Design an enzyme around this catalytic site. Structure first.
Site, PDB file in Angstrom:
ATOM      1  N   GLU A   1      -9.255   0.912  -8.694  1.00 26.45           N
ATOM      2  CA  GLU A   1      -8.124   0.397  -9.433  1.00 26.45           C
ATOM      3  C   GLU A   1      -8.474   0.285 -10.904  1.00 26.45           C
ATOM      4  OE1 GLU A   1      -6.320   1.549  -7.505  1.00 26.45           O
ATOM      5  OE2 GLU A   1      -4.664   0.148  -7.427  1.00 26.45           O
TER       6      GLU A   1
ATOM      7  N   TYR B   1      -7.440  -1.297   4.381  1.00 24.77           N
ATOM      8  CA  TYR B   1      -6.874  -2.604   4.620  1.00 24.77           C
ATOM      9  C   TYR B   1      -6.486  -2.770   6.078  1.00 24.77           C
ATOM     10  CZ  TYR B   1      -7.054  -3.117  -0.331  1.00 24.77           C
ATOM     11  OH  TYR B   1      -7.525  -3.186  -1.620  1.00 24.77           O
TER      12      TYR B   1
ATOM     13  N   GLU C   1      -5.344   6.343  -2.894  1.00 22.01           N
ATOM     14  CA  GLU C   1      -4.599   5.177  -2.480  1.00 22.01           C
ATOM     15  C   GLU C   1      -4.316   5.213  -0.977  1.00 22.01           C
ATOM     16  OE1 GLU C   1      -4.599   2.675  -5.787  1.00 22.01           O
ATOM     17  OE2 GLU C   1      -4.012   2.370  -3.688  1.00 22.01           O
TER      18      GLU C   1
ATOM     19  N   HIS D   1      -7.778   3.624 -12.383  1.00 21.41           N
ATOM     20  CA  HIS D   1      -6.362   3.974 -12.521  1.00 21.41           C
ATOM     21  C   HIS D   1      -5.708   3.284 -13.707  1.00 21.41           C
ATOM     22  CE1 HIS D   1      -6.551   4.614  -7.898  1.00 21.41           C
ATOM     23  NE2 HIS D   1      -6.962   5.687  -8.550  1.00 21.41           N
TER      24      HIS D   1
ATOM     25  N   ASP E   1       0.826  -1.201   0.000  1.00 20.40           N
ATOM     26  CA  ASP E   1       0.000   0.000   0.000  1.00 20.40           C
ATOM     27  C   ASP E   1       0.866   1.260   0.000  1.00 20.40           C
ATOM     28  OD1 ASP E   1       0.765   0.455   2.800  1.00 20.40           O
ATOM     29  OD2 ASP E   1      -0.685  -1.126   3.293  1.00 20.40           O
TER      30      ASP E   1
ATOM     31  N   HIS F   1      -7.165   3.675   0.695  1.00 15.25           N
ATOM     32  CA  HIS F   1      -7.268   2.238   0.458  1.00 15.25           C
ATOM     33  C   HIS F   1      -6.342   1.578   1.488  1.00 15.25           C
ATOM     34  CE1 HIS F   1      -8.306   2.511  -4.155  1.00 15.25           C
ATOM     35  NE2 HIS F   1      -9.154   3.175  -3.395  1.00 15.25           N
TER      36      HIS F   1
ATOM     37  N   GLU G   1      -1.830  -2.187 -11.403  1.00 14.22           N
ATOM     38  CA  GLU G   1      -3.182  -1.748 -11.023  1.00 14.22           C
ATOM     39  C   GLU G   1      -4.331  -2.680 -11.437  1.00 14.22           C
ATOM     40  OE1 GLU G   1      -4.164   1.497  -9.364  1.00 14.22           O
ATOM     41  OE2 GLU G   1      -2.059   1.240  -8.771  1.00 14.22           O
TER      42      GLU G   1
HETATM   43 ZN    ZN Z   1      -4.390   2.788  -7.807  1.00 13.95          ZN
END
Ligand code: ZN
Lengths: 334, 265
Positions: free
Chosen positions: A248, A158, A151, A251, A120, A154, A214
């Protein structure tokens, strides 16, 4: 116990060892290719200095009159998808994790969530230090600006998710320690070094490498989680997973968009060799590391899905399919 | 305070802030509660250009004095390293705040442009300064950042104080102005856009006061007051040389207190 895990891993040991072998002789086939195309690659790296994307436009200062509607609109599309971890309802999750999931399911979701956390920040650099910095056009800057920010959310999701299913500090430890001893990790590392970190590398080639990262390198994980949405469980997880997958996907699409604006594009042979190697490392994860059988999935159909996602990518780059397979998972129709 | 600066340079190694954080895979058991709450706070205020209405806001523009139109022109034209600071702050909490800040900066750069567009027509022809961007006053601004931040011979705590100057001191004049021109019914749009940027810019400045605060080795109290003053000088300058008050000193002191100093003005 670890008895079944060996039984399962064993069902694809021959298929797996092949991919391994195949991937073993890439660090060598690559130095060779580079050794014999020095004259040509030297011209490409040069012309790179002529690519609109890779060079400033001093005449443009208004910063508005949309010169690249394709991109901006991509960014706006992203900018309208803003979301926070605070929106994820996990209340009903801890229950499902303890009353509807077997020990094999928890063992799969865990490692899968751990893989996500183990990458990450490594990708934080690629996006900037090896990308955003380049691409001297505002539309693209705005996009990457927003990508890095998303990101980071994200990465929070997680940890948050992991912090809810695996509270025990000790276990959370073994989790990652057992996740750092996976061959795929080095294999991915080697792949990167070959198409990203290695100097004398073309921007156009990194673009395919980045997009692979990605939209190919985790496609199986995202897939394995929608599989839970089916059985109607972990709505906390499947909600977040749905949002991140969308992200994703976006991206990736963005990578392909920039690619299209490049005057001199990477040999389709190279674009295919990059995506294809990715697909092999990805499959290997589920044929060696985490068997999809652990949560009722079919090894063979997973491979197909990955190969499908790559072909779909290859095509979004101008290349032609390579596996030509079809999407095996109807639920991934989206 | 020459010798002591040499010690801080060797001390910046004990700074857990600038130090490593390695081995922390999962990040939720938060280690930096303060900067994290700072990040959550700006994350909650996320806004966009679309959330701003300039339509029926451009009416009150062409009704302004012949020169008041020239003012706003440069004001926008002006506005229209965070990466380095972010690279030095070794933790998920801080880098998240920074990634958000540069993200928001691009939205400001857009809203500003929109005004330049809805007001001074599509052509950037009306914006005068746009052609002579690099003019004296800015060169002085660029020198300041060239003094405490870019200069190799600088310390983290120092670069922090300078950064805040550049974030909160500097354009204080701008907002101070627009808060006026957007005082009572006039231009509801530029008003909301300004209210926001000022709010976020304030937070981005505080964040550096928050980091600084957590520094174990602070620099000499005089150097601080030495960094702010200069920016207050570089501010008053173009702030009263570009277009047609001493508001800077007020802010300049609050920030001075922000780093634990005495109000110079
Ligand atoms: Zn990404």
């Amino acid at each position: 116990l670890n008895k079944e895990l060996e039984t399962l891993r064993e069902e694809n040991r021959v298929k797996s060892d092949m991919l391994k072998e195949k991937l073993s002789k890439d660090a060598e086939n690559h130095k060779a290719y580079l050794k014999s195309h020095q004259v040509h690659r030297h011209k490409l790296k040069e012309m790179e200095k002529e690519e609109p994307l890779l060079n400033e436009d001093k005449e443009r200062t208004v910063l508005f009159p949309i010169k690249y509607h394709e991109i901006w609109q991509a960014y706006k599309r992203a900018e309208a998808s803003f979301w926070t971890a605070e929106e994820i309802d996990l209340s009903k999750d801890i229950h499902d994790w303890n009353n509807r999931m077997n020990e094999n399911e928890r063992f799969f979701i865990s490692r899968v969530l751990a893989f996500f956390a183990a990458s990450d920040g490594i990708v934080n650099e690629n996006l900037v230090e090896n990308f955003s910095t380049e691409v001297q056009i505002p539309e693209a800057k705005s996009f990457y600006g927003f990508q890095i920010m998303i990101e980071n959310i994200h990465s929070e999701t997680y940890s948050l998710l992991i912090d809810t299913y695996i509270k025990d500090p000790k276990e959370s430890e073994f989790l990652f320690n057992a996740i750092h001893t996976i061959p795929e990790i080095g294999e991915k590392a080697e792949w990167a070094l070959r198409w990203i970190q290695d100097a004398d590398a073309l921007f156009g080639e990194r673009l395919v490498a980045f997009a692979s990262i990605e939209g190919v390198f985790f496609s199986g994980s995202f897939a394995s989680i929608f599989w839970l949405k089916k059985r109607g469980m972990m709505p906390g997880l499947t909600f977040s997973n749905e949002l991140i997958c969308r992200d994703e996907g976006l991206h990736t699409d963005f990578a392909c968009l920039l690619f299209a604006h490049l005057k001199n594009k990477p040999d389709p042979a190279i674009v295919e060799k990059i995506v294809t190697e990715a697909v092999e490392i990805e499959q290997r994860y589920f044929l060696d590391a985490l068997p999809v059988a652990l949560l009722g999935m079919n090894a063979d159909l997973m491979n197909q899905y990955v190969e499908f996602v790559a072909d779909r990518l290859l095509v979004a780059f101008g290349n032609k399919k390579y596996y030509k397979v079809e999407n095996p998972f109807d639920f991934m129709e989206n | 305070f020459q010798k002591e600066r040499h010690d801080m340079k060797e001390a910046e190694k004990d700074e857990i802030l600038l130090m490593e954080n390695s081995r922390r895979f999962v990040m939720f058991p938060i280690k930096y509660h303060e900067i994290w709450a700072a990040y959550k706070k700006v994350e909650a205020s996320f806004w966009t250009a679309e959330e701003i209405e300039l339509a029926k806001d451009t009416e009150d523009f062409q009704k302004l004095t012949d020169d008041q139109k020239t003012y706003i022109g440069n004001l926008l034209a002006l506005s229209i390293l965070i990466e380095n600071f972010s690279a030095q702050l070794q933790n998920p909490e801080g880098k998240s705040f920074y990634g958000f800040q540069i993200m928001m900066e691009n939205i400001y750069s857009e809203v500003y442009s929109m005004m330049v567009d809805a007001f001074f027509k599509d052509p950037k022809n009306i914006p005068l300064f746009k052609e002579i961007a690099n003019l004296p006053e800015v060169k002085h601004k660029a020198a300041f950042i060239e003094r405490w931040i870019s200069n190799d011979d600088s310390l983290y705590a120092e670069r922090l104080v300078a950064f805040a100057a550049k974030e909160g001191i500097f354009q204080a004049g701008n907002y101070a102005s627009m808060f006026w021109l957007t005082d009572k019914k006039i231009m509801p749009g530029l008003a909301m856009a300004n209210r926001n940027i000022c709010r976020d810019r304030g937070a981005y400045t505080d964040f550096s006061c928050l980091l600084f605060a957590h520094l174990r080795t602070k620099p000499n109290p005089k150097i601080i007051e030495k960094i702010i003053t200069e920016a207050v000088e570089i501010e008053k300058e173009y702030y009263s040389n570009s277009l047609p008050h001493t508001y800077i000193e007020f802010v300049a002191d609050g920030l001075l207190q922000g780093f634990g100093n005495e109000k110079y003005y």
